[PDB]
Amino acid sequence: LESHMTPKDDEFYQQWQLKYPKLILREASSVSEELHKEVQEAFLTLHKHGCLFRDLVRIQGKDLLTPVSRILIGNPGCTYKYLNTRLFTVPWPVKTEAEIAAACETFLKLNDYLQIETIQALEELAAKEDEVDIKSRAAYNVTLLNFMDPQKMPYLKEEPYFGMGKMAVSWHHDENLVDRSAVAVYSYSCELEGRDPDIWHVGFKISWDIETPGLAIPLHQGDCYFMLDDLNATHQHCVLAGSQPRFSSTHRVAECSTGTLDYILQRCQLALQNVCDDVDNDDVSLKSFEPAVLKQGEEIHNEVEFEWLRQFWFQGNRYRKCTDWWCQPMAQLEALWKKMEGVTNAVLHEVKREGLPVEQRNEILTAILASLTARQNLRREWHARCQSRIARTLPADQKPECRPYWEKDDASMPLPFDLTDIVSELRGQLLE
Ligand SMILES: CC1(C)C[C@@](C)(c2cc(Cl)c(O)cc2O)Oc2cc(O)c(Cl)cc21
Ligand SMILES: O=C(O)CCC(=O)C(=O)O
Ligand SMILES: [Fe+2]
């Protein structure tokens, strides 16, 4: 028999107390009516503007459209990878259309509240037994807003292990967050035996384990729960659907290191340091052909192409919908990437040079081969996603573009989109 515990069960309380002291529930009544009102109409304002989208992700070779629709809000220039998809933040105001702007400021306000609340709970957790690590682990820099109308799903998956009923989101961890960082969730739903099917819950279980009954926490309008310290790492959680639509705001400390606009612009500039930068034209000449430098260049070339450009454009107009913040950055990154395409072309030219000693030539190939191989394989992978049957089902404002894509016989680009011949020839030379 698959069982779980809820507040109806005598044992729930001791189970929570003893086995989940890093899980906190602050009920709606602990949060002012003022914040509740401001936050709930911010959700509606964003929903009404169509700012939340389902994502067409890629998982285990499978293109899947997420049941839940979402928008990422947070520090300007920050991003968050979620199921191999890089989400780009709609900026909130610290250091557009008035309404959407206002909403973002609201979610920042909520962020401030939750943050303080989290530090407090971390400090009490510490009192049950530096301060820098506490503030570091509650410094939320993004929220991922989620929405689902359980009515639009024709059939929801049964919870596999504990008989928890229908799932909106099955078991997982929140990934790519700062080590041991808290996660804080504001939950907003409208309105014998086991959990009430009509009510939203969050479910928790320990990783690896389906023998300890899972916990299902009911979540009524405006309840907040917090996952503290290592909880998110040691436990899985899921979201159990009720009968009515529900939003949530999930505040996180995203690991914002190789995932910011400042970082990737810096990487680009680093690559371009190998380029004679007098004038911007098709005559790209390189300062050095030292293995280590050419490798770095080609790696950055792949980084901006696949982690940034292709991720951003995969979503169609999913970002210009509610902000134009990323317009100039993406135009600038693409112009940066286009120069780097000139860089690969010049490298290929150097390699082909008849005066080049074979030893130096081979040392260059060994430097760049893995990068160009990855670039080939990754392109094939991306082009396929853009052409999948599920991708073509999407609406016009969402349908994936495979930007940047060029047909060949497009004299504007120095190299072909399809690198298989070039790769095969490079690899063939190194076997001479
Ligand atoms: C991958 C899988 C099947 C499992 C699960 C539980 C999931 C979510 C997240 Cl966020 C995670 O980091 C890891 C996970 O296993 O939930 C979703 C939700 C979705 O919308 C889609 Cl398309 C796929 C999935
Ligand atoms: O909505 C919640 O309570 C958790 C968030 C979540 O599971 C998600 O959509 O990633
Ligand atoms: Fe989650």
Cis check: omega of the bond before 193, within 30 degrees of 0: yes
| All residues at 6 or more sequence positions from 353 whose CB lies less than 8 Å from its CB, including other chains | none
Strand partners, 225: 25, 185
Beta strands in 32-104 (DSSP E): 53-59, 62-74, 79-82, 85-88, 90-91
Q: How far apart are CA 235 and CA 250, in angstroms?
A: 17
C-alpha dihedral, 304 to 308 to 310 to 311, nearest 10°: 160
Q: How far apart are CA 35 and CA 128, in angstroms?
A: 30
Q: How far apart are CA 142 and CA 10, in angstroms?
A: 37
Beta strands in 283-333 (DSSP E): none
Q: Do 330 and 312 form a contact (C-beta atoms < 8 A)? A: yes
What residues are designated binding site for 2-oxoglutarate?
Answer: 146, 225, 246-248, 250, 252
C-alpha dihedral, 385 to 62 to 253 to 89, nearest 10°: 30
**Helix pair angle (291-302, 261-272), 10° resolution:** 140
Q: How far apart are CA 423 and CA 421, in angstroms?
A: 5
- This structure was determined by X-ray
Q: Six-digit token pair at 280? A: 């911007």
H or E segment and range at residue 261: helix 261-272
CATH number, domain 4-260: 2.60.120.590
Q: How far apart are CA 202 and CA 216, in angstroms?
A: 6
Direct distance between the N- and C-terminal alpha carbons of the chain, in angstroms, rounded to an integer: 65
Q: How far apart are CA 255 and CA 84, in angstroms?
A: 15
How far is the CA of 363 from the CAs of 95, 301, 316, 359, in angstroms?
Answer: 48, 19, 40, 6
List the domain boundaries for the chain.
Answer: 4-260, 261-394
Ligand 2 close to Cβ of residue 39 (< 6 A): no
Ligand 2 close to Cβ of residue 185 (< 6 A): yes
- CA 169 to ligand 2: nearest atom: 7
Ligand 2 pocket test target in 250, 251, 252 with most atoms within 8 Å of CB = 250
Length of the chain: 432
Chain interruptions in the chain, by residue before each (C–N > 2.5 Å): 95, 129, 191
Please tell me the residue having the least CA distance from ligand 2 atom 9.
Answer: 146
Work out whether the CA dihedral 213, 219, 223, 225 comes out positive or negative. Answer: positive
Q: Which amino acid is at 81?
A: K
Q: How far apart are CA 321 and CA 145, in angstroms?
A: 16
Tell me how far the alpha carbon of residue 19 lies from the centroid of ligand 1, in angstroms.
25
**Helix pair angle (131-138, 99-127), 10° resolution:** 150
Q: Do 104 and 143 form a contact (C-beta atoms < 8 A)? A: no
* CA–CA–CA angle 87, 305, 319 (5° rounding): 30
Locate tokens 């700062």: which residue? 178
What residues are designated binding site?
Answer: 70, 82, 146, 172-175, 225, 237, 246-248, 250, 252
Q: Which amino acid is at 383?
A: H
- One of 3.40.50.11260, 1.20.58.1470, 1.10.10.60, 3.40.190.10 is the CATH number of 261-394, namely 1.20.58.1470
What are the φ/ψ torsions at residue 87 (nearest 5 degrees)? Answer: -90, 145
Task: Give the CA count within 13 Å in the CB-facing half-sphere of 303.
Answer: 20
Q: Six-digit token pair at 42? A: 């911010």
Strand partners, 206: 235
Please tell me the residue having the least CA distance from ligand 1 atom 2.
Answer: 170
Give the chain's largest Cα–Cα span: 84
Work out whether the CA dihedral 156, 162, 163, 165 comes out positive or negative. Answer: negative
- CA 202 to ligand 2: nearest atom: 3
Tell me how far the alpha carbon of residue 127 lies from the centroid of ligand 2, in angstroms.
29
Closest CA relative to residue 215, chosen from 170, 266, 162, 174 = 162
Tell me how far the alpha carbon of residue 187 lies from the centroid of ligand 2, in angstroms.
9
Closest CA relative to residue 215, chosen from 144, 141, 276, 164 = 164
Ligand 2 pocket test target in 185, 188, 189 with most atoms within 8 Å of CB = 185
DSSP string, 127-189: H---HHHHHHHH---EEEEEEE-TTT-S-PPBPTTT---BEEEEEEPPPSB-TT--EEEEEEE
What residues are designated binding site for substrate?
Answer: 70, 82, 172-175
Q: How far apart are CA 224 and CA 331, in angstroms?
A: 39
Q: Do 270 and 343 form a contact (C-beta atoms < 8 A)? A: no
- CA 66 to ligand 1: nearest atom: 20
